[PDB]
From Swiss-Prot, chains A, E, F:
One of its GO terms (biological process) is negative regulation of apoptotic process. The chain holds residues 33 to 193 of 300 of the full protein. TNFR-Cys repeats lie at residues 1-38, 40-81, 83-118, 120-153. This is Tumor necrosis factor receptor superfamily member 6B. The keyword Nuclease does not apply. It is found in: Secreted. It comes from Homo sapiens. Disulfide bonds join 17-30, 20-38, 41-56, 59-73, 63-81, 83-94, 100-118, 121-136, 142-153.
From Swiss-Prot, chains B, C, D:
Residues 3-138 form the THD domain. The gene is FASLG. It is found in: Secreted. Glycans are attached at residues 41, 107, 117. Disulfide bonds join 59-90. Induces FAS-mediated activation of NF-kappa-B, initiating non-apoptotic signaling pathways. Can induce apoptosis but does not appear to be essential for this process. The chain holds residues 143 to 281 of 281 of the full protein. It comes from the Eukaryota. Residues 1-138 are extracellular. This is Tumor necrosis factor ligand superfamily member 6, soluble form.
Length: 153, 138, 138, 138, 153, 153
């Protein structure tokens, strides 16, 4: 259990007090005749580490219109956010995932942390669409199929 | 006890803006908050300030306006105390962010209601360290 | 009575700028205005501030400079206290608007004359809620 | 004697920034500077402010961030008090210059260390009239 | 006549006072033994509605180099501005009226509130000029006339 | 020797004091029984004119990474800076000197105050290089030499 120094504001007298744990804060400091008293973080508050605060921290992260709560506000941690489905984080914004245009397909979709990833459809395959998910498909086995258009019968 | 306020951003769709006044970095001491407004209750000199942080994915240079203003009963019309406007502030199409800072001294009367107000409420970001509104009595 | 000033924009072609000091939102109490300058008459600590609002029809990124400075008799040369510069601030060709805010604390002596000064006097807009210059004794 | 500070820019490669506190326009009275930080030694209300001036030869819209924050022993983690961010602020390729101004009121405790901090230390210009960090007790 | 409440700052005693009209402001509040006394707005000041101000508002609108006074400062209203001849209001600025180039003519000139309006000169008509006022004129009745150039003899 | 007025803060009594010279500042004002006492500017300080300051000015010009000291900080003047070799001052920045591309040569190099100056190599001469210093040279006297390429044998 980690500790902390404290002059009594009564006797000026040097004590070693003990720190409140996560989920709590100092509510009365230790004096000669007692140890520290810790209290519960009220609602919308938190402390996440061993601390000697006189009041709990405020859960001051709020989620954008394009984000959802990754963690929630809890007595032990601040709320945490991430890009909602269909978005990825970049420079503090939440951007829509790319679509790959026609003749391109998705080699990797967009996660919360990244964009869609596309390739030029390789020989023997095609993509008809602006799609953030549709991937390059092999032509049909019957005009020559392009990467954008299927082989025609 | 010094008459003082530091209000911080809060999520609503209203003009004027509305503010957090208890939690976190907020302060409110000897001054009242009512329906978005700080309500002066001792005629005097006060320094008054507001910062607001604007941001968007895609710059389109919508004009940004940031206003501190006053109302009371004594006359039926807003009086503007401080104001900034920004035009042609981002490169069109880009992610952008900028802030407006206003701060100055005013003689104010009891019963004066002060409010902040803004052009593009969608563009405003309401983090408590980024967007705020305050004063103190001298 | 608290030593205080809030000067507001005024129409002239001079550097430094000149200010309104009675009408409207202006204040001047225990401090003097003379030929564009606030004239300190009690050595002490003061918070000093200025905002100026620039605007133009057609952006050409002329450099904008905004300066608070001091002079007295004791030495024959301006001393700059606060300064902002803006370059590459509008998209060339567009209508634009931006403001410069300066504010800070200074120890000042009696007989100090403080002035504000600026690069492109044509670019300045002098509305009282937009362009101002003030201080107060701590 | 009023508790007060006005720190000014200084040349180092550290985050947080470090400041001049004696020479020139610097002030420091009843408040301490230690390893970049102002060290509060009387619980109370203070107005706190910082300006920083950014500039570069060739605009590339690197995101600019400007933060005032606090630490103490009581909890092992920075707390941010004020912050600005700028994105899409110069025309790509051009010489540019812009400043960030932050100022607001805070209740602070003895033993609080306040610091300023910034995204692109190469972009910062450290002239004393351009880049500063201060507070005063109310 | 609209009214207003007033504690006497002498007796603390609740009164109903009467408001000063446009052009005036409260100069002494009503007390037990008298009604409200109103005074005239001084120069450069105004009040525009029934009010209980202790000082008149300041006429704080001033006219740009590209504007003229629409209304003037008067004890009953603030000064008001508009774009001078040859300009139109847009986004708080006063812009020069468009000229229509050649082969275009003015279907509507620029008002204080709008730009010039142009059309492609219609068949049978032309415009030689960059003019903010000249309108498309029918060719002459004698090379074929374009919309930019007259028919030639 | 220029002078300055001074009320005694002891007797309120009007004196004419004498100003400290460059390199010094007022350290005790003149009173009835003595003249002004001036002291030396401490390190990192200066006064450059006849003055009545109670403290010397601070040498507050510092040199950029692209500048060198033109003057140094001295008790008689502030430090002064200029663009280092290979740079020129413009809009408060220190920019690299232009190179002239091929088929151009340097008619004037870059000073601290200006850029490189180039001309189209004139007939009979050429430049092979992007050089901030190389100047147009006459072709060789043996394919026809261009301004970019030498005459070939
Ligand atoms: Na990123
Ligand atoms: Na409009
Ligand atoms: Na130049």
């Amino acid at each position: 259990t980690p500790t902390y120094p404290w002059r009594d504001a009564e006797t000026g007298e040097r004590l070693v007090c003990a720190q409140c744990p996560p989920g709590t804060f100092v509510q009365r400091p230790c004096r000669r005749d007692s140890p520290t008293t810790c209290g519960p973080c009220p609602p919308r508050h938190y402390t996440q580490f061993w601390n000697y605060l006189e009041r709990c921290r405020y859960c001051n992260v709020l989620c954008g219109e394009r984000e959802e709560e990754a963690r929630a506000c809890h007595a032990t941690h601040n709320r945490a956010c991430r890009c909602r489905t269909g978005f990825f984080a970049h420079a503090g914004f939440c951007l829509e995932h790319a679509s790959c245009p026609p003749g391109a397909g998705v080699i990797a979709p967009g996660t919360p942390s990244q964009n869609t990833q596309c390739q030029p459809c390789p020989p023997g395959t095609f993509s008809a669409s602006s799609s953030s998910s549709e991937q390059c498909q092999p032509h049909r086995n019957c005009v020559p199929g392009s990467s954008s258009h299927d082989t025609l019968c | 006890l010094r008459k003082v306020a530091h209000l911080t951003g809060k999520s609503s769709r209203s003009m004027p803006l509305e503010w957090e006044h208890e939690l976190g970095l907020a302060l409110l001491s000897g001054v009242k908050y009512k329906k978005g407004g700080l309500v002066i209750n001792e005629t005097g000199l006060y320094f008054v300030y507001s910062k607001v942080y604007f941001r968007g994915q895609s710059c389109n240079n919508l004009p940004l306006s940031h206003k501190v203003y006053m109302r009371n009963s004594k006359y039926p019309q807003d009086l503007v105390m401080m104001e900034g406007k920004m035009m042609s502030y981002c490169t069109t199409g880009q992610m952008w962010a900028r802030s407006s800072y206003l701060g100055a001294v005013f003689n104010l009367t009891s019963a004066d209601h002060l409010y902040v107000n803004v052009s593009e409420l969608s563009l405003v970001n309401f983090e408590e360290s980024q967007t705020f509104f305050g004063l103190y009595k001298l």
